[PDB]
């Protein structure tokens, strides 16, 4: 029954700790349902049961603020932070009571009396944003907050007879059927064609191409409302724009009376090593989109801050965009703790510091193996290293999986990974990771030889035998007796 | 500075009671914010504000299950159940341990281990749902609920060669721009057009209707993808159907192979009586959309469960349709303790009782005011009651509100009025409210006849000086005195 | 003169589709195009701004004059203008349709834009 699968669910929450049969238990349940109601995909192309071992890497519960523990008791790093969500770190105390107070008094509003927390951060949000951005809508995620979003712009702009939207290729926005008009991967887009008209994407870093949309559309009538683009593309694989660009964007906004929306979604919350990406810059857009980080890794939240002059749209009619779970209060709480927890131990500075250790780390890695590694790339705690192949590259976020480091990465789409840490990621977790991904390099390059070695044609086996051996008595030969073979095999030629 | 504003709203949610000043201070501020930096709007148009007193009525905390406590102490009987979010009323025992449990071990996932509680509860969705029904997706809203079930719908039918959707005129269905193709309301869509392409309109409740739309699609090779639609109009005003249309459309759909959608947002769990709408006619949806009640007025949460014929659109690509936080474990944990007390107190059971007791209520109340109500309407605990002027609606909505009764409306849109208490509503609590709205109706037409007195041409100062008169002396006759004034004044005539 | 017209045209265009006007030329065209693109899933057309092609709603979704098109928008959809004599541009419009799933069914210019001011393009174009 529904009624008995409900109280098993419920009283597995109050458990805490598990017998070795009671973890078997539950991950062949979680494993049998993933399979038979959720999707069976997931235990496909994700890494946690591909590398999971004899058991998939089912979660249980936070470590510390960096550390995540699996129904084994296995204890992981955190170098993904949910993509880029837990930017104060797992169950951040500061956070969680701040959440378990208002949990105490009222966890969502009636939706008819004024409710106070949503002022309190409205306001703070007000004064923590650059420039003019005033007014905040609050929502419950990433794609809900760019809807709105486009929602506003529109509102504001077609009064003024303004329709077309510019987005950036290799931009990510949301999954929904709004924000989905603006996300520009083919895989992503196609099967849910076709989206909303008037959407047109240019090159990211192109402020040459911009222009030119936005002189075309202008030219045959169909004059562009707003871009829309984010400061890094972060799924995009850590693409960084320019100098100058989103300055330069702003003003092209300007002469050609287009609203500019910024996606900090993912730069949002400190991670750049700016509270915004958009201050690295000193650009203030027309209207900001915030998420993920914003609720502290405890509660789910979207925030669309905009300057008066664009928010006036929504006051003489306040009921045309509401959503029904917007700025409930323990959400607000959450974020008034996420900002204060980011502005005290000023946790910017720290991304800044930690995120130019780490990444530089990466580059060192990145010219000691050329040959699996064609770039690492960030700003601040976010970065990303890209591998050459797909192959390779699932084989680097699995094999640290492995060294209990979590990174990116699916089965698939896995050329390019990111790391995203908490910004709490201590000096001593630091060098764990770069170390790890120093002997997952090592191994790697191991078997990526090791091949090599094998279809060698010219090479006798008698040969290719001797340096089988010396590969697996001398990992750290890999490179040598690879040389050695190659060397060899040229010679009989 | 925002460290500053953090801080202060960091310290108001340690705080459990107000001294009144410390009252008197918050609701300025909160009102302050609210015109600055929220919307000014919610000031103009709510009725916390224009009958909120000499303050406004900024909430505070919840009461009992059923009762609300704003700043200054005074406690409110919520008959709107934030639109149909807390059917187990506010802070539910059950649910705020099992969420506060959840929140001890790990409030979000790491979205790269499989999370535990997103299986159980995909289960236990299966185990509720009637048919086929047998996979769930999770997302944050109403909204995301139905983007993710449109999202479903076109991925199975493009292929197919099906790309138009049929909703209903009065359809709500969410304000992000997907769903606001199917949403129906001119108010709410006009100035965010153009919409999603494809999107067309039938009355609800017209099967001779509905079938023409499918069948000039199917002509003119515009065939259906699928059909949405609410069990119950609810934000529409509380529409019924005509008994066997739900079942009919079901079939007609099963006809031109239409995927049929039900939009169960606002009368999912067990609010009509059965713990979903489409269980009174046992009709079974390739798509249902849950979200609101799910969350038990703790969490913010949306699923969408499918067959396993159209869900399979996803298998072989997981991520085609992902979101943020969807099915976090501390949400999920919400709805599971949502769906044991449900079916544990078997509150669909209550629903239907006090659902008849109170609708009847109304209906007598409105048959001995005609001349202030056209009707009242409902099916369980939904349930509305139409007057006859927007006056005269939010006339009603707010008195109540001063007799610490809170019901729907706002300024404008108020003509027909919603009562959606908790299903955990007391038999003592259910007179109560219809107590308050007898007294409410008298005070309205008193007024109504006090007016009516006076522009009585041909009555004279001196009879109608004697008329307001008794009025005052005894409300009670302001129906007798008004037709002796009218009486009076055909006299004279 | 389906005949003649095969024989007086370059390279292997044979077939002659025969209408009464200049805009229903350039309809046809766009009709030929879509029929023959969709089925390969591609529905986008790049025309060239300060391109004349029509007053018909079809080929008025391709001529690019402001004045010409505004008052009657919505006009088809999926029409996308670059600069005239930019192959620059051109790769590009190209290239990010191909990128985000809205591939180029077919590009549709003028040899020189004639009403578009006797504008030549670059020898090469």
Chains 1, 2 share one sequence.
Not at 127 to 146: H, I, M, R
Not at 216 to 227: P, Q, S
């Amino acid at each position: 029954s529904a009624l008995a699968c409900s109280a098993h669910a419920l009283n597995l929450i109050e458990k805490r700790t598990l017998d070795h049969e009671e973890m078997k238990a539950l991950n062949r349940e979680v494993i049998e349902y993933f399979k038979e109601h959720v999707n069976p995909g997931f235990l496909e192309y994700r890494k946690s049961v591909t590398a999971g071992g004899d058991y998939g890497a089912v979660e249980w519960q936070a470590g510390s603020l960096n550390t995540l523990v699996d129904t084994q008791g296995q204890e992981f790093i955190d170098c993904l932070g949910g993509f880029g969500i837990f930017n104060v770190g797992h169950r951040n105390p500061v956070v969680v009571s701040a959440v378990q107070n208002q949990l105490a008094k009222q966890p969502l509003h009636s939706q008819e009396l004024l409710d106070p927390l949503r002022a309190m951060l409205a306001k703070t949000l007000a004064a923590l944003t650059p420039g003019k951005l005033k007014y905040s809508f609050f929502c419950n995620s990433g794609t809900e907050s760019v809807e709105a979003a486009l929602k506003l712009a529109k509102a504001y702009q077609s009064p003024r007879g303004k329709f077309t939207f510019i987005a950036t290729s290799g931009a990510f926005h949301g999954k929904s059927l709004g924000a989905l008009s603006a996300t520009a991967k083919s895989t992503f887009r196609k099967p849910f064609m076709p989206l909303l008209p008037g959407f047109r994407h240019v090159p990211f870093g192109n402020i040459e191409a911009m222009r030119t949309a936005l002189n075309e559309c202008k030219k045959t009538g169909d004059d562009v409302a707003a871009v829309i683009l984010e400061p890094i593309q972060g799924e995009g694989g850590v693409i960084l724009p320019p100098p100058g660009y989103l300055t330069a964007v702003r003003k092209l906004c300007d002469e050609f009376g287009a609203l500019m929306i910024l996606d900090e979604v993912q730069t949002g919350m400190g991670r750049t090593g700016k509270m915004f990406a958009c201050e690295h810059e000193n650009v203030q857009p027309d209207i900001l989109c915030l998420a993920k980080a914003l609720g502290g890794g405890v509660m789910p939240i979207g925030a669309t801050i905009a300057t008066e002059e664009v928010f006036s749209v929504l006051f003489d009619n306040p009921f045309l965009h509401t959503t029904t779970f917007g700025g409930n209060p323990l959400a607000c709480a959450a974020a008034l703790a996420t900002i204060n927890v980011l502005l005290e131990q000023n946790l910017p500075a720290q991304a800044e510091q930690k995120g130019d250790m780490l990444l530089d780390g990466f580059r060192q890695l990145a010219r000691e193996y050329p040959d699996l590694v064609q770039e690492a790339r960030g700003k601040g705690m976010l970065m990303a290293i890209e591998f050459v192949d797909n192959e390779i590259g699932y084989n680097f976020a699995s094999e640290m999986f492995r060294q209990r480091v979590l990174v990116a990465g699916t089965l698939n789409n896995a050329k390019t990974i990111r790391i995203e840490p908490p910004l709490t990621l201590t000096i001593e977790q630091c060098e764990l990771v770069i170390k790890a991904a120093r002997k997952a390099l090592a191994a790697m390059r191991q078997q990526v030889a090791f091949y090599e070695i094998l279809h060698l044609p010219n090479l006798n086996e008698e040969q290719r035998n001797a340096f089988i051996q010396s590969l697996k008595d001398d990992p750290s030969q890999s490179a040598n007796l690879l040389a050695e073979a190659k060397k060899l095999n040229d010679a009989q030629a």
